[PDB]
Design a binder for this molecule. Structure first.
Ligand code: CLA
Ligand code: CLA
Ligand code: CLA
Ligand code: CLA
Ligand code: CLA
Ligand code: CLA
Ligand code: CLA
Ligand code: CLA
Ligand SMILES: CCCCCCCCCCCCCCCC(=O)OC[C@H](COP(=O)(O)OC[C@@H](O)CO)OC(=O)CCCCCCCCCCCCCCC
Ligand SMILES: CC1=C(C/C=C(\C)CCC[C@H](C)CCC[C@H](C)CCCC(C)C)C(=O)c2ccccc2C1=O
Ligand code: SF4
Ligand code: SF4
Ligand code: SF4
Lengths: 80, 74, 74, 43, 141, 61, 135, 742
């Protein structure tokens, strides 16, 4: 599966979570930013590696990164 | 003579592209900035924009005028 | 004579432009403005997706790929 | 004012370029019409 | 200079070409006038003017004079272009002034572009030509 | 640094690294990147604002 | 456990292949206020029933996509289930009953790096080691 | 409800304000440029009116006004062509001597030596030889002097003025409401009866009263000065009686159904006029009269304001059967609520029609002295095939744009459109297969042949002298059409085309048209056409059917019509959008039509066109080398491309030199395209970073930040230069060749 890492530069805008077409990401409590929430990637086995989350992320540089790893049936987006 | 010149010039071209390919693989996989602190390799990377911009110029400069003269002549 | 002048200048263009592609590929292999953490993704990778304006052929490997067209042209 | 709007349109990149490169082409074409075949400056 | 170069007025190949010289423009003597001018050049065996670009003063017309005239016009264009960009950057709507020319700003700059070499030297010897490497954006190393 | 102070960026992965931006606000709290800096030129995503830590900034004005 | 009647005009060549029998299958359930037309994940205009609807889908992305379309119909009670060939139905979205874009207490940070992305080590440093530069 | 004129008065105030506000029309663009991507987006979105405003009424008004704009520029162009004919041509010399004088209506200025392009075209005139067939059009019109062209040109400039005013008026001053636009029944009635029906009746009038008499006298060898002016045939009846006795009968035979009294000026001759090698004016007259009647009848089908007539919605709704569920129910709403659904249809069928026109015009040359003008014949065929192919791909594009933007599930549930979406995997899988089958059993035969010939095994080839593949069906149809006159078309004298059979017809020394025999080389090339069309359709149909979704991207409709990808995930999703299928279909359209015009060019030069000996023996331009050469790729490379490129490459220092320059220029533009197609944005943005660094270093960094072209623009620029370069090459090739041999 692909690896999705969140970095402490996250502002908790939730845009990555909303963008994700396979519900990999979710918002979890945090004290690090004003929004008081950080992105998390609990379900990276469902990550297809589309990088919609990175396109969504408004921080410079990105606070979410997808590192494309071992390809599986779920990661290759196969219905067969 | 034609075969042997073409053959070796084609090989030379592959070896030259490989040299730069493996040079890029070195930079991305092997190059330690901390071990190369202050040396010629770090300095080259420090003004890489200046090197690439001047290469862009020489290429454009050669390209415009050489194609220009050929097209003029043609 | 004049024919040898124009074609030597075409060869120079060829050598500088192949170099430009490969050197740019080498010196941007570890990162650029568009992809600052490029070293984390290695030598060969498809892209970093259509975000930030699009990043097709952004890897150091993709400079090797582009350079060989110019190497063959030259 | 409608004059100000035309001047702004004339000064817009593609219209400004067209007028300027037409003048530049015109100058070059006419110079070559009255002084053709200048391969070098004669001495 | 070299590779069977003779004065064009001595090369039989040139005279042969001159007798069948095509009229470039409406002027019916334009064909002859061309070969009359090109007679002073060096011609190869086939009778085409070859240009010598080594900075020989007796061949200054070939490349040296065209070079000076080009560098003066190209430098004008570049300086006027640079001048305008620096002028509009001091205003508020700089991006709009790029795609929609402020002729009030542009035309005076264009007019004063004849004196670009003086302006280029002055600005080179004032540290006002370049920015500092530390104040220009760069990629991570 | 405070509101209106021109700052140069020291973050090397920042689009605006060694570019000048205006400090829009400084969040008076314990957050790691409290200083909101606006920029004249947009990045590749098209945004012109970003959060920075005080150590990543040099006040120039 | 999955209750709901299959929507009308649910048939197309874009439906379940042999994977659904051999590897895994997904279901998406939702309660509709009214019978209304909706575009299927893989083409075709299907009709929702008033009440519980059950649609089998090859990929979880079909469920999330359809979920997004159901939100445009003012429906937010959709549940996606992964179904294995042993008939082991697993409720997978929303994981904890709250939608992931909304913050819920109890969720822990997963794959969080307490650094800026610029502060990752060089590939040379983690060379011949198990770890990567983003670890 | 009733069709009626209903407009809003002064909807948009006319002012230059918005001319000074680039990108005013889009909310995003209105904010202004920040990067150079903005400058591209401005042009890209300019005429995408659906993105300007949501209001269908405002979109309909913009489209109606824009059309008056496009009619004005086309009228300016047609007026220009006729003006250049009146002022800068050898038309009058060409009328006096059609066979010897070469048509020319473009004179070059004497500057930088380009006057060489003003070649000796005959009629003591120096200019570029034209291949647009304007001289043959004007001769067919019965125009015999420069003054008649001047009048027609000025008339055109006035019509172009009227079209500009109309477009301004019908947008800024009196803009029709959406009600008006959605009267499809009234529009079809008026466009069938007036535009086509009355246009065809009107033209029958001109043919019968002006063209047929003037052409008949010119074919009788009467001097152009001696021929009466076209109004003298109306004012002086005696002159017209002398040419066509049927006019003696007057208009009473028309009203009393004694139509045989007009058999002399309304004919069904068939074949070609032996003098001119064009269709008979009297056949063309009767055609346009018959067309006019059928159209005026046809355009009384649709109900407007008087109950009588069909409603198209009821027709569509009633056409359903046991395979197609609700059938054509909901398609009326698609075609009356989406402009893209209409543009898709109209581009697909106008494109298909333009290709039919290409075929019908070479085989049945309708204009006098067209058939023997081999340069015009080749060029108008190739031209109209290209226009046809582009329009068809446009049809597919706008079909995909409709599916993404304007398709409603509610309107289109269990109808023909809905049901095709539900077996799209079965459609595309079968079309995929037939493409591979055709590819192997069409192209593979050429590869078989090349290999057999190369191995010194000609007996093992697919050829007329080896393993034959005779196109027996096309051969059988040719025979039926040849036997038609006297048989299944009793009142025809000759066949519709000599291409089907009959004799060699010759005008001057040259073959106007003769029978186009089909053998193994014709069977092979026809199955190549079938292949290259089926693959283009595979790409475009896949584009339209998978525009909204696929098994890969379920929510593709949300990403839109024109997006570069959905990222490197799922293995990589590059070029999944309906836009990207159009991009790929253009290359295949280009590949397909290239082989069509190459087929036409070589087949006509080897088997049709050529000189005719007094005895009647036909010596063809390439001496019938098609049968044995056009069955291998080597034969195409050698006997077609290599052989016929001699004229274009040897054109320097002559009047055809321009085609030699265009030939290289086009090869360059084509090769340049490969930079855009083979590369990606990422590389170019990183190169621009370093160039921007140097501009920053010297304080010349632009406020509008430079960006590499978008992924989509990269592809758009790629395919644009590829098509331009490729097509322009063949254009230069065809001209230089056919202006020498033809
Ligand atoms: C001189 C010695 C040399 C050595 C020891 C290496 C070694 C290596 N190279 Mg380098 N390289 C070299 C020269 C060399 N290279 C040259 C001259 C070039 C320029 C072309 C390159 C360009 C290059 C690139 C771009 C990359 C490497 C990579 C590598 C590594 C992996 C290679 C691999 O697994 O591919 C497996 C082998 C193949 C895929 C071979 C298939 C390609 C051949 C040529 C196909 C030929 C077609 C067909 C057979 C002909 C048909 C005939 C027709 C008539 C039908 C390995 C460390 C890779 C790496 O990641 O480095 C760590 C990598 O990405 N090399
Ligand atoms: C004929 C084919 C062709 C041509 C002309 C080019 C030209 C160029 N390439 Mg490209 N390239 C090509 C094929 C080609 N490439 C292919 C197949 C690939 C593989 C994908 C690439 C991949 C590639 C890479 C990776 C790079 C290049 C770069 C370049 C530039 C080198 C700069 C230079 O020396 O020339 C000077 C410029 C020219 C010769 C351009 C043409 C000048 C025109 C004709 C003048 C036009 C003016 C005229 C009035 C306009 C008329 C048009 C009208 C509509 C207004 C040059 C623009 C490099 C670059 O950008 O360096 C700066 C670079 O890094 N190319
Ligand atoms: C844009 C720059 C430009 C410049 C500097 C000139 C300069 C000139 N033109 Mg030219 N001209 C131009 C563009 C230009 N023209 C264009 C675009 C056209 C096409 C409409 C013409 C058509 C034209 C004609 C018909 C004539 C001139 C003539 C002339 C000369 C006499 C005075 C005059 O302006 O008229 C002068 C050297 C005249 C001349 O001296 O020729 C004998 C003349 O008769 N010009
Ligand atoms: C890219 C480089 C290039 C260069 C260096 C040249 C150079 C030249 N060209 Mg060529 N040409 C080129 C590309 C190039 N061309 C291309 C791409 C084409 C195809 C479009 C041509 C097609 C072409 C033709 C058809 C002709 C030329 C001619 C010329 C010559 C004279 C031009 C002139 O206007 O007189 C000099 C002009 C001046 C001195 C006026 C400038 C006055 C300034 C404004 C004063 C400023 C005050 C300080 C000059 C040697 C002409 C020639 O004479 O051939 C030998 C000629 O007839 N060129
Ligand atoms: C004022 C305008 C200006 C100035 C002073 C420069 C200066 C420079 N350019 Mg840049 N450049 C410009 C505009 C300018 N450029 C534009 C509009 C483009 C987009 C085509 C580029 C694209 C570009 C590339 C790709 C490269 C350069 C490079 C360079 C450097 C080397 C010289 C060269 O290669 O010329 C190159 C010239 C061109 C590509 C054509 C220039 C087009 C026109 C003539 C300039 C614009 C004039 C403007 C419209 C005038 C308006 C003035 C008015 C409002 C008063 C030099 C610092 C090179 C470099 O980095 O060297 C280290 C390099 O590789 N430039
Ligand atoms: C619609 C397309 C069309 C095209 C492509 C052309 C193209 C041409 N025209 Mg024609 N023309 C047209 C419509 C067109 N015309 C119409 C509608 C009229 C009636 C007003 C004319 C009346 C006309 C005249 C009277 C002349 C031309 C001339 C020309 C040639 C030179 C253009 C020029 O003078 O630039 C000049 C540059 C500018 C105007 C911009 C600066 C060029 C081949 C000239 C020609 O053929 O010379 C031998 C010429 O004298 N045209
Ligand atoms: C009556 C015919 C017709 C009409 C009214 C339209 C109308 C439209 N098209 Mg459709 N289209 C058509 C035919 C037509 N098209 C054809 C024949 C094709 C096949 C190529 C297409 C393929 C197509 C695509 C792929 C797309 C459209 C889109 C659109 C919309 C936006 C267009 C725009 O803003 O262009 C702006 C104009 C430009 C960017 C300039 C175009 C210049 C072209 C590329 C090259 C011209 C070269 C020329 C022939 C030679 C001169 C060369 C010389 C100058 C050097 C608009 C509704 C777009 C859309 O999004 O729909 C909603 C869209 O993405 N069309
Ligand atoms: C010469 C260049 C070339 C060739 C050979 C192909 C071939 C193909 N294209 Mg491609 N295409 C090309 C250029 C080419 N393309 C370019 C430049 C583009 C960019 C626009 C595309 C974009 C493209 C699209 C978008 C599509 C295609 C499709 C196809 C396939 C059509 C089906 C078919 O005919 O199968 C039959 C195979 C052939 C005709 C190839 C030659 C067969 C030989 C003669 C027989 C085999 C000999 C022997 C047994 C070899 C093995 C033995 C050996 C190992 C010892 C076919 C494989 C389509 C497709 O896949 O649909 C089915 C499709 O949709 N292509
Ligand atoms: C082909 C003959 C044809 O179109 O058959 C006709 C048949 C449709 O028959 P229907 O009687 O249902 O048609 C009714 C309406 O659609 C026409 O108004 O088409 C099909 O069954 C689907 C197409 C399969 C074609 C496979 C290839
Ligand atoms: C070459 C190339 C580029 C680089 C090309 C670019 C950025 C286009 C820029 C060219 C235009 C012509 C610059 C015009 C600048 C000014 C408007 C010119 C002003 C001067 C005139 C008035 C004379 C891409 O950006 C790209 C993107 C995606 C896939 C492939 C490619 C690709 O192949
Ligand atoms: S790469 Fe795609 S699937 Fe993976 S987390 Fe990001 S948005 Fe979700
Ligand atoms: S990772 Fe980026 S997009 Fe996601 S919540 Fe954090 S800042 Fe927002
Ligand atoms: S189109 Fe470009 S950005 Fe998108 S997935 Fe392909 S390579 Fe990556």
């Amino acid at each position: 599966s692909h690896t999705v890492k969140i970095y402490d530069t996250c502002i908790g805008c939730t845009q990555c979570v909303r963008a994700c077409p396979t519900d990999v990401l979710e918002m979890v409590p945090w004290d690090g930013c004003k929004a008081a929430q950080v992105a998390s990637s609990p379900r990276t086995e469902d990550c297809v590696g589309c990088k919609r989350c990175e396109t969504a992320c408004p921080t410079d540089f990105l606070s979410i990164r997808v590192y494309l790893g071992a390809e599986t049936t779920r990661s290759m987006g196969l219905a067969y | 003579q034609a075969a042997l010149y073409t053959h070796h010039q084609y090989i030379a071209i592959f070896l030259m592209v490989g040299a730069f390919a493996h040079g890029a693989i070195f930079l991305v996989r092997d190059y330690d900035p901390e071990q190369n602190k202050g040396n010629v390799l770090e300095r080259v990377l420090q003004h890489k924009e200046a090197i690439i911009s001047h290469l862009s110029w020489v290429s454009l400069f050669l390209g415009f005028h050489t194609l220009g003269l050929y097209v003029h002549n043609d | 004579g004049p024919g040898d002048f124009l074609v030597h200048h075409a060869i120079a263009l060829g050598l500088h432009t192949t170099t430009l592609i490969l050197v740019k590929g080498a010196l941007d292999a570890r990162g650029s403005k568009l992809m600052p953490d490029k070293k984390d993704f290695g030598y060969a990778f498809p892209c970093d997706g259509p975000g930030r304006g699009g990043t097709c052929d952004i890897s150091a490997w993709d400079s090797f790929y582009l350079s060989l067209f110019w190497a063959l042209n030259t | 004012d409608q004059s100000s709007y035309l001047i702004k349109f004339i000064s817009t990149a593609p219209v400004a370029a067209t007028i300027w490169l037409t003048i530049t082409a015109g100058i070059l074409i006419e110079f070559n019409r009255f002084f053709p075949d200048l391969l070098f400056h004669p001495l | 200079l070299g590779a069977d170069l003779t004065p064009c007025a001595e090369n039989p190949a040139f005279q042969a070409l001159a007798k069948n010289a095509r009229n470039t423009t409406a002027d019916p003597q334009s064909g002859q006038k061309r070969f009359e001018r090109y007679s002073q050049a060096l011609c190869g065996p086939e009778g085409y003017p070859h240009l010598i670009v080594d900075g020989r003063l007796d061949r200054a017309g070939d490349f040296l004079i065209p070079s000076i005239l080009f560098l003066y016009i190209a430098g004008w264009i570049g300086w006027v272009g640079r001048a305008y960009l620096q002028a509009i950057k001091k205003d508020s709507d700089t991006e709009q002034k790029e795609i929609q020319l402020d002729l009030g700003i542009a035309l005076p700059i264009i007019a004063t572009g004849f004196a670009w070499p003086a302006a280029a030297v002055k600005e080179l010897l004032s540290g006002e030509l370049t920015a500092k490497d530390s104040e220009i954006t760069v990629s991570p190393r | 640094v405070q509101r209106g102070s021109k700052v140069r960026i020291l973050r090397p992965e920042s689009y605006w690294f060694q570019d000048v931006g205006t400090v829009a606000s400084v969040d008076q709290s314990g957050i790691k990147y409290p200083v909101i800096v606006r920029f004249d030129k947009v990045n590749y995503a098209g945004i012109n604002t970003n959060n920075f830590a005080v150590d990543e900034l040099i006040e120039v004005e | 456990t999955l209750s709901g009647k299959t929507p009308l005009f649910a048939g197309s060549t874009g439906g379940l292949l042999t994977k659904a029998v051999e590897e895994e299958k997904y279901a998406i359930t939702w309660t509709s206020p009214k019978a209304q037309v909706f575009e299927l994940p893989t083409g075709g205009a299907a009709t929702m029933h008033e009440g519980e609807n059950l649609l089998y889908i090859a990929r979880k992305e079909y469920g999330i996509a359809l979920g997004g379309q159901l939100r445009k119909f003012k429906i937010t009670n959709y549940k996606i289930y992964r179904i294995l060939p042993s008939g082991e139905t697993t409720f997978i979205h929303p994981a904890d009953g709250v939608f992931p874009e909304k913050v819920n207490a109890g969720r822990e940070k997963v794959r969080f790096n307490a650094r800026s992305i610029g502060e990752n080590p060089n590939p040379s440093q983690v060379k011949f080691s198990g770890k990567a530069t983003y670890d | 409800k009733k069709a009626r004129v209903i407009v809003d008065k002064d909807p948009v105030p006319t002012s230059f304000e918005k001319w000074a506000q680039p990108g005013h029309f889009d909310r995003t663009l209105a904010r202004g440029p920040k990067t150079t991507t903005w400058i591209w987006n401005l042009h890209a979105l300019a005429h995408d009116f659906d993105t300007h405003t949501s209001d269908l009424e405002d979109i309909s008004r913009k489209i109606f006004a824009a059309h008056f704009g496009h009619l004005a520029v086309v009228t300016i162009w047609l007026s220009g062509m006729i003006f250049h004919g009146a002022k800068f041509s050898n038309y009058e010399a060409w009328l006096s001597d059609p066979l010897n004088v070469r048509p020319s209506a473009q004179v070059v200025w004497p500057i930088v030596g380009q006057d060489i392009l003003n070649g000796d075209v005959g009629g003591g005139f120096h200019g570029i030889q034209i291949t647009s067939g304007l001289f043959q059009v004007w001769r067919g019109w019965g125009i015999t002097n420069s003054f008649q062209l001047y009048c027609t040109a000025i008339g055109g400039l006035v019509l172009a003025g009227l079209f500009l005013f109309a477009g301004w008026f019908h947008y800024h001053k009196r803009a029709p409401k959406l009600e008006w636009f959605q009267n499809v029944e009234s529009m079809l009635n008026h466009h069938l009866q007036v535009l086509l029906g009355c246009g065809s009746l009107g033209w029958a009038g001109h043919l019968i009263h002006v063209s047929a008499p003037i052409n008949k006298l010119m074919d009788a060898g009467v001097a152009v000065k001696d021929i009466p002016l076209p109004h003298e045939f109306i004012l002086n009846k005696s002159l017209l009686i002398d040419l066509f006795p049927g006019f003696a009968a007057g208009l009473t035979p028309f009203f009393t159904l004694n139509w045989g009294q007009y058999a002399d000026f309304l004919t069904f001759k068939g074949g070609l006029n032996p003098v001119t090698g064009g269709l008979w004016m009297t056949d063309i007259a009767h055609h346009h009269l018959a067309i006019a009647v059928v159209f005026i009848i046809a355009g009384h089908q649709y109900r407007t304001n008087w109950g009588i007539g069909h409603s198209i919605k009821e027709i569509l709704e009633n056409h359903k059967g046991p395979f197609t569920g609700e059938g054509h129910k909901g398609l009326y709403e698609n075609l009356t609520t989406s402009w893209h659904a209409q543009l898709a249809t109209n581009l697909a069928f106008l494109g298909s029609l333009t290709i039919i026109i290409a075929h019908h015009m070479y085989a049945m040359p309708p204009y006098p002295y067209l058939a023997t003008d081999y340069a015009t014949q080749l060029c108008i065929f190739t031209h109209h095939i290209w226009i046809g192919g582009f329009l068809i791909v446009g049809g597919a594009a706008h079909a995909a744009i409709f599916m993404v933007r304007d398709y409603d599930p509610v309107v289109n549930q269990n109808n023909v459109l809905d049901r095709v979406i539900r077996h799209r995997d079965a459609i595309i899988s079968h079309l995929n297969w037939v493409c591979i089958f055709l590819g192997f059993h069409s192209f593979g035969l050429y590869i078989h042949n090349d290999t057999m010939r190369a191995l010194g095994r000609p007996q093992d080839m697919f050829s007329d002298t080896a393993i034959q593949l005779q196109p027996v069906f096309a051969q059988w149809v040719q025979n039926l059409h040849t036997l038609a006159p006297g048989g299944t078309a009793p009142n025809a004298l000759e066949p519709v085309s000599y291409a089907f059979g009959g004799g060699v017809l010759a005008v001057g020394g040259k073959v106007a048209m003769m029978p186009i025999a089909l053998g193994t080389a014709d069977f092979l090339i026809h199955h190549i056409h079938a292949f290259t069309i089926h693959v283009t359709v595979l790409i475009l149909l896949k584009g339209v059917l998978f525009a909204r979704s696929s098994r890969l991207i379920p929510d593709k409709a949300n990403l839109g019509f024109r997006f570069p990808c959905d990222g490197p995930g799922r293995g990589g999703t590059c070029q999944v959008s309906g836009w990207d299928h159009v991009f790929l279909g253009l290359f295949w359209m280009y590949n397909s039509l290239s082989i069509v015009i190459f087929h036409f060019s070589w087949k006509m030069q080897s088997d049709v066109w050529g000189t005719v000996d007094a005895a009647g023996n036909v010596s063809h331009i390439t001496g019938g080398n098609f049968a044995q050469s056009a069955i291998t790729i080597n034969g195409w490379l050698r006997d077609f491309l290599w052989a016929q490129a001699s004229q274009v490459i040897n054109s320097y220092g002559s009047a055809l030199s321009a085609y030699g320059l265009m030939f290289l220029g086009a090869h360059f533009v084509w090769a340049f395209s490969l930079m855009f197609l083979f590369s990606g944005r990422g590389y170019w943005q990183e190169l621009i970073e370093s160039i921007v660094w140097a501009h920053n270093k010297l304080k010349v960094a632009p406020a509008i930040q430079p960006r590499a072209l978008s992924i989509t623009q990269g592809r758009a620029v790629g395919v644009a230069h590829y098509l331009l370069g490729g097509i322009a090459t063949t254009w230069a090739f065809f001209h230089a060749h056919i202006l020498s041999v033809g």
